[PDB]
Amino acid sequence: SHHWGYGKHNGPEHWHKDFPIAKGERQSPVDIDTHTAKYDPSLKPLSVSYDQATSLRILNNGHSFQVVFDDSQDKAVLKGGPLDGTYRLLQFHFHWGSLDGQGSEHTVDKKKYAAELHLVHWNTKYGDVGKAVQQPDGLAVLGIFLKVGSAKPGLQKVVDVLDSIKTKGKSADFTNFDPRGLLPESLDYWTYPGSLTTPPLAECVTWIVLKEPISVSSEQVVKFRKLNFNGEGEPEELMVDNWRPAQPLKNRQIKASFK
Ligand SMILES: [Zn+2]
């Protein structure tokens, strides 16, 4: 135990000691009970504007890998849906399992998906992400489920560089990556107020979870599972099962954009 992770001695059941908000009133992820979520005709269609996105780097950050974007202008922005104002894309990352029957953070009628993609955006009215994480409407995370079947062609560029970032601290140039290639057809979604799913567990996120999963191939997710939690020179621990389980809903309402 010590610095946080996903292991027996430092995983999700330990996080509350360093981050007491772990037991807070609006923690994430949650189970999405599809029959209880209420269709809200007042919600808007989600506006996902990624045409001008500028990817920078790909990084193994010890807990996942992330692709980072230039967020110094309104290039790649999320608006509409449940959101007021404009949210800039900062990065995306994934959570995944050791086997295909677990890996997602959100669940749908208790179903776990093989993985979950998070595209993290911050509200421009707070000026920078560090300020945004201190606000209840600071961040919008677009969550997308992954199931195993056919390959996702738009993911392959990511998959093919993972061998260059095997261990914690490694990064690589990752320019000209188009995150539109990671999106499903439909933008139908569920939304609720929640939190970051990792330390610091800040209660600053409007969650937007797409109903339609993307399909990835077994070869694609196998390459995720070859990443290491450990740094180079340390005992090899596969980066798998880097997901937080569902947390209590606590009288929050999950709303559906669709009937
Ligand atoms: Zn995440």
From Swiss-Prot:
Residues annotated to bind Zn(2+): H93, H95, H118
Cofactor stoichiometry and binding remark: Zinc. Can also use cobalt(II) with lower efficiency, but not copper(II), nickel(II) and manganese(II).
Broadest EC class assigned to this enzyme: lyase
SMART domains found in the cross-reference section: Carb_anhydrase (SM01057)
UniProt-reported outcome of changing V120 to A/G/I/L/S: Reduced CO(2) hydrase and p-nitrophenyl acetate esterase activities
Active site per the UniProt annotation: H63
Outcome when changing T198H: Higher affinity for bicarbonate. Enhanced proton transfer capacity
Site keyed Involved in the binding of some activators, including histamine and L-histidine: positions: Q91
Effect of P200A: Normal CO(2) hydrase activity, but impaired stability
UniProt-recorded Gene Ontology molecular function terms: arylesterase activity; carbonate dehydratase activity; cyanamide hydratase activity; zinc ion binding
Annotated Alpha-carbonic anhydrase domain residues: 2-258
EC numbers on record: 4.2.1.1, 4.2.1.69
Residues carrying the site annotation Fine-tunes the proton-transfer properties of H-64: Y6, N61, Q66
Consequence when changing V141H: Impaired activity
Record's disease association: Osteopetrosis, autosomal recessive 3: A rare genetic disease characterized by abnormally dense bone, due to defective resorption of immature bone. Osteopetrosis occurs in two forms: a severe autosomal recessive form occurring in utero, infancy, or childhood, and a benign autosomal dominant form occurring in adolescence or adulthood. Recessive osteopetrosis commonly manifests in early infancy with macrocephaly, feeding difficulties, evolving blindness and deafness, bone marrow failure, severe anemia, and hepatosplenomegaly.
Record-stated family: Belongs to the alpha-carbonic anhydrase family.
Self-association and partners: Interacts with SLC4A4. Interaction with SLC4A7 regulates SLC4A7 transporter activity. Interacts with SLC26A6 isoform 4 (via C-terminus cytoplasmic domain).
Protein name in the entry: Carbonic anhydrase 2
Species this protein is from: Homo sapiens (Human)
Lineage of the organism: Eukaryota, Metazoa, Chordata, Craniata, Vertebrata
Name of encoding gene: CA2
